């Protein structure tokens, strides 16, 4: 829904959404062909579903297509430093796609602004939403006709007529972190078709036992997940599906 959301934050005021207590289909996400640029640096998209994390952050913003290369771990540039900086060590993926027909219009697209002027580079995963009037601030009088000082935010020039690379490309960068806390967002779990009355190796939520599964007669308590025997050998399991 975030990818298919109509509203996208600007590059300087990039939205920060904390994803927790759900499952994301990274296999389907990579299988999607709408993304022009799908670069993964921490975990390969093939193994991303298998890899399990605990916190996922989504940064939604719109940038010029030529700045997609600048949006990357260990990268330098106006966009890469002044309004969206990434750590040298990166655990995530970068997703970009064409958006010329979506947001670009015949009129000027001034809704998106970029931090043209900044005194120093920003720390990774830090946003400067303060629309301070004059970046340099040589004189605190705040004169309208600034000479050594200028407005850091400028409107993007977007036009579908060009279509050369200046067109806006929707870019979202993910961050997977291990906070030594139990997982909340994890990859999808593949469930094979269960087979009964056959000697089949099984794995029910980590039971990883081997034996032939038959329909049972014992009735569990609704909260109880799997049975047991006198000798502490598993002899009944509740099918999760």
């Amino acid at each position, epitope marked *: 829904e975030v990818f298919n959301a109509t509203r996208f934050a600007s590059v300087y005021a990039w939205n920060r959404k904390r994803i927790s207590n759900c499952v994301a289909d990274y296999s389907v996400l990579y299988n999607s062909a709408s993304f022009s640029t799908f670069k993964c640096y921490g975990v390969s998209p093939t193994k991303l579903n298998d890899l399990c994390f605990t916190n996922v952050y989504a940064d939604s913003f719109v940038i010029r297509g030529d700045e997609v290369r600048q949006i990357a771990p260990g990268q*330098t*540039g*106006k966009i*890469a*430093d002044y309004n969206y900086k990434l750590p040298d060590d990166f655990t995530g993926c970068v997703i970009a796609w064409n958006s010329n027909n979506l947001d670009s219009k015949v009129g000027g697209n001034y809704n998106y602004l970029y931090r*043209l*002027f*900044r*005194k*120093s*580079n920003l720390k990774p995963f830090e946003r400067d939403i303060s629309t301070e009037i004059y*970046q*340099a601030g*040589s004189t605190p009088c705040n004169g309208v006709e600034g*000479f*050594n000082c*200028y407005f850091p935010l*400028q409107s993007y*020039g977007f*036009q579908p*007529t*060009n*279509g*050369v*690379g*200046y067109q806006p490309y929707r870019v979202v960068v993910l961050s997977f972190e291990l906070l030594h806390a139990p997982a909340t967002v994890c990859g999808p779990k593949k469930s094979t078709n269960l087979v009964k009355n056959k000697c089949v190796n099984f794995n029910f939520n980590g039971l990883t036992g081997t034996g032939v599964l038959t329909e049972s007669n014992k009735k569990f308590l609704p909260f109880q997940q799997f049975g047991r025997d006198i000798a502490d050998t598993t002899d009944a399991v509740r099918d999760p599906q």
Partner: antibody, heavy 117, light 107 residues
Framework: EVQLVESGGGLVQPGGSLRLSCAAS????????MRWVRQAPGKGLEWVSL???????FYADSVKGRFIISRHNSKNILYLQMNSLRAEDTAVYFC???????????WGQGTAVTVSA | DIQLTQSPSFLSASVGDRVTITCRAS??????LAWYQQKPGRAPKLLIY???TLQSGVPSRFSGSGSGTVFTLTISSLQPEDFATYYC?????????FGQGTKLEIK
């Protein structure tokens, strides 16, 4: 007002190193977009190197790696180091102002830097 | 890379004559092109920055038009002392190239 003075043009030898100097009045080198553009005799201007306010140095394809830029905080003096120069690099280098998209305003005076052996 | 070229780069005209200087970029740069004026033995000066507009301090006789891959520098009143070498540069680019340049002289 604001004036930029360019100095440091003179004869050097191949493989040498000379410190180009640019003095800016009324500007702060810390929060400005210094850029170096040279003008060969009988030829137009051509970009050489670019440095952002906070770092992130940029270089042209022809002079990539060969040239290194490091501005000094002392009296907001702009500096441009040269390394592995060639005889084709003889030109009149010029200084720059901080405006990236709002269009440039002023340059340095510019001095020719003759490189030969 | 993006390359810029000005034509015919050598135009002769008299005073009070409209002269158009075109810098058609080989690659799209939208309206992010700046017009300069490099007098001989001096440093260049900007006339138009980004889209068609007027730099603070330049005469009002300088104007521009066009965007994308086509640009045009228009002078309504060709003063005797505005004949120099004009340059075009991509402002919103990490590697900002310069145009070939055009020469103006007394006809």
């Amino acid at each position: 007002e604001v004036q930029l003075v360019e100095s440091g043009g003179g004869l050097v030898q191949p493989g040498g190193s000379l410190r180009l100097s640019c003095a800016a009045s009324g500007l702060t080198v810390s929060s400005n977009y210094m850029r170096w553009v040279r003008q060969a005799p009988g030829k137009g201007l051509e970009w050489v190197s670019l440095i952002y306010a906070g770092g992130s140095t940029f270089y042209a394809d022809s002079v990539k790696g060969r040239f290194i830029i490091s501005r000094h905080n002392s009296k907001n003096i702009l500096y441009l180091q040269m390394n592995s120069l060639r005889a084709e690099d003889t030109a009149v280098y010029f200084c720059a102002r901080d405006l990236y998209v709002f269009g440039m305003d002023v340059w340095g005076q510019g001095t020719a830097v003759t490189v030969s052996a | 890379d993006i390359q810029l070229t000005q034509s015919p780069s050598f135009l002769s005209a008299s005073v009070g004559d409209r002269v158009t200087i075109t810098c058609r970029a080989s690659q799209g740069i939208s309206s992010y092109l700046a017009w300069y004026q490099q007098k001989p033995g001096r440093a260049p000066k900007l006339l138009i920055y980004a889209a068609s507009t007027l730099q603070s301090g330049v005469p009002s006789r300088f104007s521009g038009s066009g965007s994308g891959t086509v640009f045009t520098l228009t002078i309504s009143s060709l003063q005797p002392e505005d004949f120099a070498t004009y340059y075009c540069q991509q402002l919103n680019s990490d590697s900002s190239t310069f145009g070939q340049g055009t020469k103006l002289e007394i006809k």
